[PDB]
Design a protein around this ligand. Structure first.
Ligand code: 5VH
Ligand code: 5VH
Ligand code: NAG
Ligand code: NAG
Ligand code: NAG
Ligand code: NAG
Ligand code: NAG
Ligand code: NAG
Ligand code: NAG
Ligand code: NAG
Ligand code: NAG
Ligand code: NAG
Ligand code: NAG
Ligand code: NAG
Ligand code: NAG
Lengths: 335, 336
């Protein structure tokens, strides 16, 4: 429960901003696979009370703040203009490390969520490679489970608390603004999707006995949370998910209800410059998007869900601390 | 003829050896590569005399050469020793692209079997993502046929030519050495396997008029070919298929005569140190297996067969060029 610090492999000649922040504000990693394996001790974890997240969070905020400068930043009727220079942008892995004395407890093996008991435990100094991908609804470029899909929540019996669904077979998603220049779109292969929501539905049913399971879009709110919003090559993509998070889990099987066509599902995307910042409760304005093909080839690795004779589930997000929690669940700082 | 170049999503921060090699041997892939479809054409392909295969072969040889360094390398009477560190091993997709002045022809006839005429043709810059998986008998993590199973051979009536069966439904296989530190095992669901060999049995029952079609284990030879040999996380697995390739397809129906248990076929595996190199003629000796659970969860996407009243088929392999052919059958390098 003390001051941690980051390590990475960020070359110092790279103009890309995450490297520029890293080099100046981090450390080159270590090739010491220091892994004090153990398997007695059955310790308690809690991925929701865990200061590593707040630590990381207010560092991603720093990163973003130093890096992506909006033309305008409004907050409390207070405008603050500056330069809007387009930059080079791509998540590099960060490792969070503890200084002496004493470091990081890590839970091992397969099906083990974020709360409570766990047996096989190792002790480490730093953590695995983590991209600080800022996104809603869908988790991108993240890790996988080495077995079966697993469900995470501070409380599933609470319709208010975000459900982090951790997958194990990633779903390819491809976003494009071709060569109306804030009109974009995203492709997602339909079978992998139906299959995914099938499995996730199956294990959702294992936590909600004999209820029909309905996947249905978000109720409403800001475009950041009611769509799959994310950053790509500096540009802020807001991607539709009406015909993605609609589908029915019935009888023991799942069937989709989203318009497909000869294989892939297409989502309508809008690039925007006015954004409601995830860092604080203000809003930022950037310059019009760069010209040319604006494309991102990304890996869907997790879901953010929100629950309402049927149980309804809608995509969540908003809070990036959750996005960090999705992978900082494993660990716990100790003496 | 040209000198292709590889392309991948290799991470420079990744210490997994395929990434390490690909980062310095290949180019970053294009996030979105576009086909150019062609009506009007009809071109001939021959998966069995393709140079792309040899090029890829060489590349994977170099890759394995730089990556997996054996403690000992023996070739006849001459032996070489060097450092043999345990590494992180997990294949990544490799694209093969033609340089400027050339292009890659791609057949989209999804019943096309590598040899002969192909009508629906497209041109591309780079191939699809191909994981250079080295294995025998079973082809792992390949692309699936898009409709009915496909039988491939340079020559079917020649029992000396290896037959490549392209499945269209992957058969999950799970190999594991649990917590004897060299004894491991694989698990396969029997139902999927029986459906598989049923349909494969049919597709073979076509090409060979009306004969009892038997599936039997490899008659003999080196363990690398008499067993399902493959690499899991740098460790060389030799898995037993006496209970897998074991059955009879007769007049419409398949019968699995191989031992099973609770619907599961379990292969008995052995992690070896002494291997017969596939790259060249000679033996390689590696260090004892690492500690902890060594598990690989893979998908069977193809089969390698050799044919002998009744027709008998046995698991083949050994020439990894076929393993590349299994994926590179669609493609043809051309100058324009
Ligand atoms: C309140 N709520 C969900 C929720 C929880 C926490 C936060 C928010 C929302 C607000 N989040 C964001 O503004 C936000 O994430 N913006 C944002 C910025 C960049 C990217 Cl790529 C992105 F995906 C989202 C943040 C507050 N920000 C501000 N409004 N302008 C933090 C619901 N009622 N569902
Ligand atoms: C000759 N033959 C089949 C055949 C064909 C070609 C080749 C071979 C065998 C030899 N192949 C191999 O040694 C080989 O593939 N080894 C090998 C290494 C690693 C893995 Cl994972 C593997 F599956 C096999 C190679 C020659 N190597 C050498 N013996 N030491 C290449 C039959 N009579 N059935
Ligand atoms: C291990 C793997 O690759 N995929 C698994 C699949 O086998 C399993 O049926 C499903 C149910 O949780 O979870 C996922
Ligand atoms: C609603 C909820 O979060 N329940 C969890 C349960 O999933 C978990 O198994 C247990 C300890 O393992 O702690 C509690
Ligand atoms: C999940 C948790 O830690 N505490 C409570 C749980 O005991 C209670 O059942 C639920 C609603 O009944 O609200 C929450
Ligand atoms: C918050 C938001 O953008 N919601 C829209 C929804 O109203 C619309 O029906 C759907 C498809 O048109 O796209 C999305
Ligand atoms: C958004 C919602 O709740 N349901 C939609 C439905 O209106 C639409 O007809 C269908 C076709 O893709 O997709 C789902
Ligand atoms: C959302 C996101 O960051 N996606 C990234 C993409 O930007 C990057 O180009 C690719 C590999 O370079 O990996 C993924
Ligand atoms: C083993 C096999 O099926 N071989 C066939 C061959 O007989 C046929 O002439 C050719 C035509 O495309 O397709 C292939
Ligand atoms: C397309 C599909 O789902 N399954 C096919 C099956 O229809 C076909 O009979 C078989 C070839 O014998 O290949 C597989
Ligand atoms: C086109 C071709 O090569 N056909 C051959 C044939 O000449 C040979 O008699 C037979 C037996 O080996 O195998 C096949
Ligand atoms: C090449 C090889 O190992 N073949 C073995 C064989 O000797 C043995 O009789 C059988 C049953 O254990 O399993 C297989
Ligand atoms: C290889 C063959 O032709 N038949 C085998 C037989 O040898 C073996 O005893 C039995 C049990 O595994 O499975 C079958
Ligand atoms: C034709 C055939 O082999 N069918 C079998 C079936 O009888 C068995 O229940 C299942 C699991 O062992 O595997 C398959
Ligand atoms: C022999 C082999 O290639 N096994 C791999 C396995 O290690 C990996 O976990 C899986 C998913 O990428 O694909 C397969």
């Amino acid at each position: 429960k003390t001051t941690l610090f980051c390590a990475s492999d960020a070359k110092a000649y790279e103009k890309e901003v995450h490297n520029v922040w890293a080099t100046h504000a981090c450390v080159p990693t270590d090739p010491n696979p220091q892994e004090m394996v153990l398997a007695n001790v059955t310790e308690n974890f809690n991925m929701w009370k865990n200061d590593m997240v707040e630590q990381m969070h207010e560092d991603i905020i720093s990163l973003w703040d130093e890096s992506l400068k909006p033309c305008v930043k409004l907050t409390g009727g207070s405008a603050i203009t500056q330069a809007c220079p387009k930059v080079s942008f791509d998540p590099i892995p960060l490792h969070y490390c503890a200084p002496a004395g004493f470091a990081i407890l890590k839970c091992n093996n397969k099906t083990f969520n974020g709360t409570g008991p766990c047996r096989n435990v190792s002790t480490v100094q730093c953590t695995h490679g983590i991209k600080p991908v800022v996104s809603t609804q869908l988790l991108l470029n993240g890790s996988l489970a080495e077995e079966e899909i697993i469900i995470r929540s501070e409380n599933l019996t609470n319709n208010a608390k975000t459900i982090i669904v951790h997958l194990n077979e990633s779903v390819n998603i491809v976003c494009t603004r071709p060569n109306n220049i804030r009109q974009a779109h995203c492709n997602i292969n339909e079978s992998k999707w139906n299959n995914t929501l099938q499995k996730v539905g199956e294990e959702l049913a294992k936590h909600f006995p004999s209820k029909t399971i309905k996947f249905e879009p978000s109720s409403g709110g800001d475009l950041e949370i009611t769509t799959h919003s994310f950053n790509c090559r500096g540009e802020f993509f807001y991607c539709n998910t009406s015909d993605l998070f609609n589908g029915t889990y019935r009888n023991g099987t799942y069937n989709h209800t989203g318009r497909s066509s000869n294989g892939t599902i297409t989502l309508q995307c809008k690039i925007k410059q006015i954004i409601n910042m995830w860092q604080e409760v203000g809003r930022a304005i950037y310059a019009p998007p760069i010209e040319g093909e604006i494309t991102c080839n990304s890996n869907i690795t997790g879901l953010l869900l929100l629950r309402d004779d049927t149980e309804t589930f809608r995509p969540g997000g908003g809070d990036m601390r959750d996005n960090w929690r999705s992978e900082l669940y494993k660990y716990k700082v100790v003496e």
